[PDB]
Symmetry: C5
Subunit: 205 residues, 5 copies
């Protein structure tokens, strides 16, 4: 329909693209994990592979609209290319994250954006003790690679990772999965960097 | 010929591209599988690799035409880039699907679009009991990743997967292969998401 | 020189690109294989890897010219992107074909195009009996994925595959290599699909 | 905000892109490594895999601005595509470097650019003696592939590689890690070529 | 500076791109190899992996300029995309060459282009006897895939491959490495094709 086309053209083509958050105009990105599977555990390189989907949500005054001005339409799906997206990166990654879902996000009239990328991540994790009852605990920090706390802040709706869609017949049973927000200072940089530490405790069944 | 060039121009260059389905203008995608081979089975990571080709069929009033108006031409082939395509994703995938066929679809004057992507998919599947006679059963859900039931609906012409082109000398014999439509409501989302559950029961020779 | 530049301009920039074959304007693609190696045989997944270069040659009235008008020039090399190319796909492929040669084709004044892509293909093949004197026979169908016989037809100049450039110190010795045209009907489709059957009989040296 | 959008426009859209350093206008790139993990060691091919992030730092008079002219904004983040980036290549690489971080850099009003690419590098390294107490030493040269000393000079803020973010539970312990500027002369070329030699001495736990 | 920007504009934007060599206007490409390593040797598939960088040197009247007309500038670096590059291909390759260096070339005022791509090549080679003192000899032909001798000629400045940057602690010691120009006739084609046979004799240390 023409109403969606006009809205899309007015938002993206008519106006310039969002130049990203500043110190003056900061942004708060909400993060959330849905752990689906612990696929592989490589004891010889201390590399662990996870399959999950990341909930990324944020709000821009830039992407707002009056639905009554565009034929009562509240939300729409658009390619992630048309919009600004947060550069949420996994620090301990050992191989590029593989995208497992379409690069499409949902934009709502209040300017709120919802992007749920499905990924396969290979990160640094010593699996020593996965064969025992007590299990093994591993962590990976997700945050903006380039933006400090002054520009992007991170928030989680819950500290508990979504295991509702965790692979039943997986080789590794989840004992605990936590999404904890943390502020960190790095040697290089005086400014702090916010991340969400994904902490998973697991053991083979 | 010039008649098709003009039709292709009047459809794609003259008019703006389809902004995807809405709640107001929904869409129904027909799905279907032709299972060719269960190539690999990784017992150590509970990963199974399938080679198949997926039938994607949908209809747009946008892509309709009077064949008499364009020198009696009923259907034409075009690059999938020129048209909107459904974001049909496999939920339990562990690695990005490899495309094994050209990105070309077929548009018919009634606006119906036919897209048959050939793919190699790696999904979550515990193959324990494949060495037995009873075999092992595994499933994978295919559906739109970003589009709900109110925007995209799924339909199957048959609940039986096409095994007519299944690799005779394959390492794994198909006992049963089913393609059935499902409706799911997830924790995240109030809106339902429609899928087609590919359920294959197999065993080694 | 300017004569070729002008010809290239008058053919590709001045005129719109070929919309592909139709039922009304069909096309006949000539195919040919030069088998270079049987690199890998995977007994555990019944996957065989071939390296070859495929001769694709077709003619378009679209790409014709009077060499006198363009400073006596019979032919020219151009990127495969500048022209329409047939969507010749291997049916039993298990992994995407890897391109091993530049995407350049030769165009002649009579509109005839010659395209020789070098590829590495992984296809379905049970190698049981390769360790024997009698050897093992495997086949792979090459044809247009999206076009029926009414649109594209296939032809071979010879039924004998070119083994003149077959890797001498290969782990597998070729007993016979045949390229044969065939017409087939698929369960899905009422229209027939033409392919060239590559049939190779081989054994380890 | 509009102030940054206008700045981004006046810098990138208004002016043509930087054609790279010349002999007349040379450039000095500061380099630095933060070694995160020695992932794999392949004794059979003398290939070693490192996970690290390289600090790239240069200044352009081209990218300078008066912050008081653009609503008091000192620095901003932009995609590496919008700007010129140094062609810092690892000489002994055996496989293409895998990018593990977003392609975003930070531009400051004095025209200074900070680019921190996270990478997985596979380079030539004989690990013979890694199983000993003394360990094994390996090196890799990083420098501009195409630009000489009179176009791109290299500098390090410190000769000590940043091990503050080195993977604690890694399979290989670090015994020493140093970033050292060196001038190379090649047979081919009249101008010398500058690099930073990354020298790491390590052993298994 | 504006002097180079203007030169780059007057060369690439103001004039059409070079349509490649013809029979009427032939070209001579100089080739050179700098062998860095024999990384892997696969005895089971008779595949050998080489790491090297190839000298590609050619002169075009098209790319010439008066340096006194463009603010005394002799040479400049540009992306290989901006210019025509020879389609030098390795005949016995078994997997696509991996690019290990930036796609930048150097253009001199006399119209001479220098392009030094660093590559990892996997080619057909029986390594039987590498464990011996005598070693094993292997060869790979490099030449234009689509252009005959009438179009492109190849030349080497020396028949001795550059081993000055050969990995000292490599698993395989080079006994001899030769780059020799060869003319061959192929079954397919009446016209001859010029190659540069890279011939390496090596053994494990
Ligand atoms: O800005 C730098 O690093 C940036 C890139 C990476 C590394 C630190 C921080 C800033 N950023 C990581 C932020 C982060 C991402 C995910 C999880 C936690 C933190 C920098 C690094 C070295 C020398 C000088 C400057
Ligand atoms: O919209 C979300 O998820 C969408 C992406 C994925 C996951 C659920 C659903 C909606 N979509 C999957 C739909 C589906 C695809 C294939 C097979 C079955 C269902 C979402 C996820 C987490 C938090 C907030 C919102
Ligand atoms: O049109 C279809 O399939 C097309 C794609 C593939 C599969 C059949 C045919 C037509 N095409 C293969 C043609 C072919 C290629 C290479 C070798 C032999 C045949 C189709 C498939 C399923 C349901 C409805 C329609
Ligand atoms: O310009 C050339 O080489 C360029 C590519 C490589 C090889 C030399 C130099 C210039 N460049 C290496 C520069 C370098 C990269 C990384 C670490 C140190 C030095 C060239 C090489 C051989 C024959 C003709 C021209
Ligand atoms: O022109 C052909 O092939 C071109 C590609 C390859 C094979 C022959 C020649 C021309 N070309 C080889 C060029 C070459 C590259 C590297 C090393 C030696 C020769 C051709 C082959 C089969 C049928 C019709 C035409
Ligand atoms: Cl794997
Ligand atoms: Cl595999
Ligand atoms: Cl392999
Ligand atoms: Cl690996
Ligand atoms: Cl490898």
């Amino acid at each position: 329909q023409a109403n969606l086309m006009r809205l899309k053209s007015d938002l993206f083509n008519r106006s310039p693209m969002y130049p990203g958050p500043t110190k003056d105009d900061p942004l708060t990105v909400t993060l959330g994990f849905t752990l689906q599977d612990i696929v592989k555990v490589d004891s010889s390189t201390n590399e662990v592979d996870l399959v999950y989907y990341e909930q990324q949500r944020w709000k821009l005054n830039s992407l707002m609209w009056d639905p009554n001005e565009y034929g009562n339409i509240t939300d729409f799906r658009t390619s992630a290319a048309d919009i600004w997206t947060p550069d949420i990166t996994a620090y301990s990654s050992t191989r590029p994250v593989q995208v497992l879902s379409p690069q499409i996000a949902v934009v709502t009239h209040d300017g709120s954006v919802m992007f749920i990328p499905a990924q396969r991540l290979s990160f640094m994790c010593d699996p020593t003790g996965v064969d025992s009852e007590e299990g093994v605990t591993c962590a990976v920090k997700f945050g903006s690679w380039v933006y400090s706390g002054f520009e992007i802040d991170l928030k989680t709706d819950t500290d508990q990772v979504d295991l509702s869609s965790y692979y039943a017949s997986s080789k590794y049973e989840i004992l605990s999965a936590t999404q904890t927000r943390q502020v960190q200072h790095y040697s290089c940089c005086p400014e702090p960097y916010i991340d969400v530490n994904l902490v998973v405790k697991f053991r083979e069944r």
